[PDB]
Symmetry: D2
Subunit: 116 residues, 4 copies
């Protein structure tokens, strides 16, 4: 797929499983249109959010529901969620992996952008 | 200073200087109302955004114009901006420092929540 | 394999390719014995460092040559290398992924520990 | 203060208090000679490690006893310690802050290098 999301847990040393993820795309009217959604697998990965034909040039926001994830482990986390906003495919079609590493009061995110 | 924002540059190994920073607070209609903003100092810090009386419980968003920072340095930046969304809670006397460490394709953020 | 190393580049938004990696194991005499070595592939991954029979209980140090990596891109980085030191398999045999995310003046590392 | 060390807790969202910190300097025989050490304050900071005259160019190692920190909080910590290895260079008047952000299975570190 042209878009994949990977989530890691820095407290447990494991993939972040069952993490809800929502993708929005900025519409012409400048509002965030819902584009795709899903949940991470046993390996902390989310595959199949979209296809090459559907994943056109645009501004995208990937929202990772970190709060729900931590609450289900008894932790009262700082953030509501992690948000990643970026322009996609404005220099031709590429493959995007959005990775996040999660702690209760901190997170980091990076992007791996590759051209097939 | 119940809220401070500090921004660092992981490429140059320096404070992120003259970075635009916006704080929004979610309203009743769940809209993002502008709350405070400014530009980071020579120390990469932004103080005096708000006061203890004005900084009530609620949901807050800190938005960092990372795109403009990297452009001014001539790196092609991946993110449109860096966004940090959290709930301010009154559980005792608290002060919040929102730190962000910036790279062209990644950022990390942490909250340092302390009792004065 | 029971030990894999993954390295990402936060400046370029890509896997960190051709990164030299050395693994040491603390010997009885309390010196660091050379245990395994290798280089990351096109995907930023290093496979085949060791086997289940060889990867016994111990204290291990994984040294990632970050300086050589950046120098070959014209960057004069802060760190000599990234070092990850940890006790392995003292609670039974497990699989270890050591991940690093690299910037010129910063890096982060995490561990994904799974039980097959 | 040409060298400061600051340590933060990504789980509790707080300064890492009373953390042991050791600084070593590589000798001619390429041995790690003890150079300075101490314990972080209530602010997670360690000042007065050295002086401008004593802090000559060379290779330095900052070692943080993260294992003992997490044990005191009852989390099973992955790393034996966190280590940061860098070359101090005289290219102009410089001051170094070595920051580390700690999780049980991960840490990130950055250098803030500034001209007084
Ligand atoms: O295919 B795999 O086995 C795999 C393993 C680990 C990662 C980790 C990515 C990462 C993101 C951060 O913000 C900080 C950090 O230290 C690591 C990834 Cl993308 C893939
Ligand atoms: O004195 B202060 O007000 C202060 C507060 C916070 C930091 C450091 C923040 C930091 C954040 C990350 O997401 C990764 C990382 O390695 C470091 C520093 Cl240096 C200083």
């Amino acid at each position: 797929c042209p878009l994949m999301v990977k989530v890691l847990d820095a407290v447990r040393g494991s993939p972040a499983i069952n993490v809800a993820v929502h993708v929005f795309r900025k519409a012409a009217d400048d509002t965030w249109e819902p584009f795709a959604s899903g949940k991470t697998s046993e390996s902390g990965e989310l595959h199949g959010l979209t296809t090459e034909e559907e994943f056109v040039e645009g501004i995208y926001k990937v929202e990772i529901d970190t709060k729900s994830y931590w609450k289900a482990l008894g932790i009262s986390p700082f953030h509501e969620h992690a948000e990643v906003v970026f322009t996609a495919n404005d220099s031709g079609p590429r493959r995007y992996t959005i990775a996040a590493l999660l702690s209760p009061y901190s997170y980091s995110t990076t992007a791996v952008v590759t051209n097939p």
